[PDB]
Amino acid sequence: NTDTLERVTEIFKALGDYNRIRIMELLSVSEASVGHISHQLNLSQSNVSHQLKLLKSVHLVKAKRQGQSMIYSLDDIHVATMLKQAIHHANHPKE
Amino acid sequence: NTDTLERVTEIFKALGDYNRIRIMELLSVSEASVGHISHQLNLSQSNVSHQLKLLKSVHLVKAKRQGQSMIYSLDDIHVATMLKQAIHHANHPKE
Ligand SMILES: [Zn+2]
Ligand SMILES: [Zn+2]
Ligand SMILES: [Zn+2]
Ligand SMILES: [Zn+2]
Ligand SMILES: [Zn+2]
Ligand SMILES: [Zn+2]
């Protein structure tokens, strides 16, 4: 319906960012904490936390506390498939 | 690589629009011409053509001339899967 399409608009508007894409891509390889994400991608923890908060609000990523810190990961299989299909579509030959 | 992620950013930034999503969704059901798309969605042909041009430049949609008018469709299976997985993710229950 109408409301459903608005929600998907939300989802895509959240992926339309270079650094959020780098965060998603990294998460598609392995779940991780803010420090790890911040270290590997060279983004500050505060910026990383700010982006994850947005990504989480549209259900693109989820978080679970394990030990001391929160461990982030792609919400579910739909998100992973969606992302991986897009990455691949961007790389294969297109004449 | 770096350039690949910029390209996927492009793709998602193009889907982050309510009307472009309505055009993609309609195309995911059936290929169609500008007039059909414009009629069904109540968007003018000029606006529809403008959006398709953008969608085409990032390889989200493709066009083929059949008869007199151009027939548009999702570029390939990756685009269709990507879109359908997202639509579904937006609708299923998420607690
Ligand atoms: Zn930063
Ligand atoms: Zn499902
Ligand atoms: Zn493809
Ligand atoms: Zn219009
Ligand atoms: Zn393929
Ligand atoms: Zn889902």
Chain A residues touching B26 at Cβ < 8 A? none
- Give the type of residue at A29: V
Q: How far, in Å, CA of B13 to CA of B7, rounded?
A: 10
* Inter-residue contact B59 to B75 (CB < 8 Å): yes
Residues 6+ apart with CB under 8 A from A18: B5, B6, B9
Q: Which fold has domain B1-95?
A: Arc Repressor Mutant, subunit A (1.10.10)
> Cα of A24 to ligand 6 centre, how many Å?
15
Q: What is the resolution of this structure in A?
A: 2.3
- Give the type of residue at B88: H
Q: How far, in Å, CA of B95 to CA of B85, rounded?
A: 18
H helices present in chain B, as ranges: 2-15, 18-29, 34-41, 45-57, 77-91
* Inter-residue contact B81 to B68 (CB < 8 Å): no
Per DSSP, chain A holds a count of helices (H) and strands (E) of 5, 2
Q: How far is CA A42 from CA A47, A79, B28, B30, in A?
A: 10, 24, 38, 43
> Cα of B43 to ligand 5 centre, how many Å?
32
Q: What ranges do the domains of chain B cover?
A: 1-95
Enclosing H/E stretch for B69: strand B69-74
Size of interface A-B (CB pairs under 8 A): 94
Give the number of the ligand closest to the Cα of residue B91: 6
- Give the type of residue at B92: H
Q: How far, in Å, CA of A38 to CA of A42, rounded?
A: 5
Residue carrying the six token digits 């027939």: B71
Q: How far, in Å, CA of B95 to CA of B51, rounded?
A: 35
Long-range contacts, A63-70 (Cβ 8 Å, 24+): A69/A33, A69/A34, A69/A35, A70/A33, A70/A34
Closest CA to B60 of B6, B4, B3, B12: B12
The whole-angstrom distance between A26's CA and the closest CA on chain B is: 11
